[PDB]
Amino acid sequence: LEEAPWPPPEGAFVGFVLSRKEPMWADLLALAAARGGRVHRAPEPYKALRDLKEARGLLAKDLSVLALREGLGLPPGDDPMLLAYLLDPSNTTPEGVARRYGGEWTEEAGERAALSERLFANLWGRLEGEERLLWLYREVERPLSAVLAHMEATGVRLDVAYLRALSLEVAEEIARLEAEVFRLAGHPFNLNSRDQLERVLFDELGLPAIGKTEKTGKRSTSAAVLEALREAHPIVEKILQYRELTKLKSTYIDPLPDLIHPRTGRLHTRFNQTATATGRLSSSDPNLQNIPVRTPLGQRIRRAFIAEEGWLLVALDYSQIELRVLAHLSGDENLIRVFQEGRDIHTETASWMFGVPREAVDPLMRRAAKTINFGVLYGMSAHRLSQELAIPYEEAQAFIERYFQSFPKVRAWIEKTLEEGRRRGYVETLFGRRRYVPDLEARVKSVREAAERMAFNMPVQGTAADLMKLAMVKLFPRLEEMGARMLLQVHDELVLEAPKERAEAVARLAKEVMEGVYPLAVPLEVEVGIGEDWLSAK
DNA sequence: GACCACACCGGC
DNA sequence: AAACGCCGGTGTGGTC
Ligand SMILES: Nc1nc2c(ncn2[C@H]2C[C@H](O)[C@@H](COP(=O)(O)NP(=O)(O)OP(=O)(O)O)O2)c(=O)[nH]1
Numbered sequence: 091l092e093e094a095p096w097p098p099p100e101g102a103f104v105g106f107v108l109s110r111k112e113p114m115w116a117d118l119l120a121l122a123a124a125r126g127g128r129v130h131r132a133p134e135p136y137k138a139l140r141d142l143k144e145a146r147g148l149l150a151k152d153l154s155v156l157a158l159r160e161g162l163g164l165p166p167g168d169d170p171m172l173l174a175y176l177l178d179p180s181n182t183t184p185e186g187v188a189r190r191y192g193g194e195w196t197e198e199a200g201e202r203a204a205l206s207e208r209l210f211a212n213l214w215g216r217l218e219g220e221e222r223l224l225w226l227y228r229e230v231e232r233p234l235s236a237v238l239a240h241m242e243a244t245g246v247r248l249d250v251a252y253l254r255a256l257s258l259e260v261a262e263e264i265a266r267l268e269a270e271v272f273r274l275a276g277h278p279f280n281l282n283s284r285d286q287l288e289r290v291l292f293d294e295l296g297l298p299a300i301g302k303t304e305k306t307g308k309r310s311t312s313a314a315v316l317e318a319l320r321e322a323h324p325i326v327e328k329i330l331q332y333r334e335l336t337k338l339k340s341t342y343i344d345p346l347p348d349l350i351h352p353r354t355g356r357l358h359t360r361f362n363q364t365a366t367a368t369g370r371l372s373s374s375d376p377n378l379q380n381i382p383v384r385t386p387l388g389q390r391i392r393r394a395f396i397a398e399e400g401w402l403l404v405a406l407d408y409s410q411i412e413l414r415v416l417a418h419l420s421g422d423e424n425l426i427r428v429f430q431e432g433r434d435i436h437t438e439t440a441s442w443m444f445g446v447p448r449e450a451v452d453p454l455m456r457r458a459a460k461t462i463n464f465g466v467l468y469g470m471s472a473h474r475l476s477q478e479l480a481i482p483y484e485e486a487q488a489f490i491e492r493y494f495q496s497f498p499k500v501r502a503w504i505e506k507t508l509e510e511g512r513r514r515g516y517v518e519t520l521f522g523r524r525r526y527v528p529d530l531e532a533r534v535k536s537v538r539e540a541a542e543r544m545a546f547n548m549p550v551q552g553t554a555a556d557l558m559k560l561a562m563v564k565l566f567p568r569l570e571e572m573g574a575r576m577l578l579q580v581h582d583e584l585v586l587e588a589p590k591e592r593a594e595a596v597a598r599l600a601k602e603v604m605e606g607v608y609p610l611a612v613p614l615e616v617e618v619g620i621g622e623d624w625l626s627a628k
Numbered sequence: 629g630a631c632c633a634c635a636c637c638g639g640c
Numbered sequence: 641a642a643a644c645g646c647c648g649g650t651g652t653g654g655t656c
């Protein structure tokens with residue numbers, strides 16, 4: 091490419107180099123653009139951002155987030171990564187996409203701009219005739235990248251002082267647990283080392299091994315194994331408690347306070363758009379899609395996520411979403427009637443599990459039933475189910491039997507999805523998002539059947555992800571008009587932030603947009619709460 | 629210091 | 641651990 095002076099013409103593709111992967115924290119080291127056989131390198135990258143109409147190129151959203159951080163309303167446009175991801179969701183990195191579609195991902199801005207132009211040309215042509223993937227690109231993924239850019243630059247408020255005080259209380263309890271574990275072991279050791287713990291439990295103590303680890307075949311110390319040994323020795327229960335507290339302290343309580351941005355005073359995640367095999371987003375740096383909620387301590391951590399003063403959080407979450415999606419995809423009349431009657435399969439499975447009336451099912455029980463309902467749907471074995479519920483093997487076998495007997499067209503849909511996946515080489519969502527599963531033809535049964543579980547899960551999980559994305563695209567402009575903020579997406583949930591006096595109107599509107607995103611054979615019901623913290627809004 | 633595999637476990 | 645699926649973060653033990 092011929093070198094030309096900054097600025098570039100309108101519509102040029104950008105390349106850029108960040109001091110680090112996280113756009114909210116990175117220095118903009120270099121900026122360049124390419125168009126019409128020329129490359130334009132910016133002498134002063136920061137000031138040079140003001141010359142761009144949009145961020146068009148590889149990782150476009152990252153540059154848009156950095157621009158918004160600096161007060162510049164630079165939206166992301168075309169991104170070859172999104173094209174590649176729609177053609178094959180194993181296209182997750184610029185390194186791989188470049189090698190695959192005609193370039194090399196380097197560390198120079200000008201070459202990255204030239205690469206973005208070359209890759210877009212080639213990838214755009216590969217989507218000729220792919221009407222459904224083209225619709226997903228233009229109507230979902232490309233506009234969604236702008237929504238996510240704004241969400242990333244906005245962040246969420248965190249009660250730092252609260253978490254600092256919580257850390258000290260948890261530290262004292264961890265001390266009580268480890269000191270007890272060492273007394274029971276007869277000697278201290280590194281309780282964070284699963285190798286050392288393995289030797290204590292199975293060699294020094296006389297506990298029987300239950301399972302082995304995957305890659306190295308060590309005697310497992312997993313929670314599932316410890317639960318099986320809960321009654322064999324009093325050290326086991328303490329280890330499980332130590333694990334819970336240290337997991338939450340090391341992963342949330344201690345690190346999150348240190349990630350508050352100095353200018354915004356809020357916590358900023360990255361919403362990765364080309365990271366999963368199914369079409370889901372992921373969240374990283376930090377991951378805000380796995381904040382605790384299940385245990386008492388976890389709920390205390392979730393309470394640290396708060397609204398700006400004078401505002402409230404609004405949390406919306408699709409009801410039984412993948413089961414509703416399954417009803418539409420499979421057309422099972424029995425499953426459709428379930429939701430047309432307003433029933434709750436999680437609460438009903440819970441009622442059976444704990445032998446109590448539906449009105450007596452608490453959230454803890456219902457959450458456990460959610461795990462059972464989807465575990466069985468996507469292929470959980472009777473053996474594992476019998477151990478999860480502490481019931482005889484024959485009773486777990488009977489539950490799985492009635493589960494599918496209740497919804498006969500589900501098995502039919504699974505078989506048809508797998509047969510089509512073998513012929514075409516891929517499975518697809520309701521909107522045509524595809525995942526290639528070559529191991530459906532594997533000649534090793536264990537491999538083939540693992541691929542089968544991956545394969546018929548994807549249309550269900552992926553359709554739910556398609557629906558959530560489309561709802562975000564529809565909802566975002568309405569929230570801007572209302573002066574509200576979209577903060578987080580957690581797969582089938584949105585967390586919004588609204589002025590207190592508008593919180594109710596925002597909650598009603600967001601609920602209606604999400605429930606009407608795309609009418610199916612069953613209604614899509616959305617549960618909504620409002621509160622000053624994330625837990626309260628649930 | 630960065631990076632890695634591994635086992636593991638937080639969420640949906 | 642076991643024939644649930646999809647993620648990202650941690651400490652250990654180890655290399656470089
Ligand atoms: N395979 C699998 N999928 C899961 C699991 N947990 C969640 N998912 C998938 C399937 C779930 O549909 C989806 C969203 O998870 P939620 O919002 O926590 N539960 P839901 O929407 O079902 O019920 P309600 O909102 O009324 O409580 O994530 C699991 O253990 N396994």
Ligand SMILES: [Mn+2]
Nearest residue numbers: 407408409410
């Ligand atoms: Mn839900």
Ligand SMILES: [Mn+2]
Nearest residue numbers: 407580582583
């Ligand atoms: Mn949810």
